[PDB]
Every structure is written in C-alpha cells, then in structure tokens.
Curated annotation (Swiss-Prot):
Has been found to be amidated by Han et al. (2006), and to be unmodified by Ju et al. (2022). Ju et al. (2022) describe a disulfide connectivity (C56-C62; C57-C68; C66-C69) that differs from that of Han and colleagues (2006 and 2007). The modification Aspartic acid 1-amide is found at D16. It is found in: Secreted. Belongs to the conotoxin M superfamily. Negative results: Shows a very weak inhibition on Nav1.4 and Nav1.8 sodium channels. Intracranial injection into mice does not elicit symptoms. Disulfide bonds join C2-C14, C3-C12, C8-C15. This is Conotoxin mr3e. The chain holds residues 55 to 70 of 71 of the full protein. Expressed by the venom duct. The cysteine framework is III (CC-C-C-CC).
Length: 16
C-alpha cells in the first residue's frame, strides 16, 4: 500500500 500522510517520509516511494 502507499504510505499515508501520517506515514510518508523520503524512504517511501509511493507517498500519499
């Protein structure tokens, strides 16, 4: 799944 707003950092390609 994508990384939600309360989750996304540079690490996470998808990034909500």
């Amino acid at each position: 799944v994508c990384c939600p707003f309360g989750g996304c950092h540079e690490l996470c390609y998808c990034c909500d």
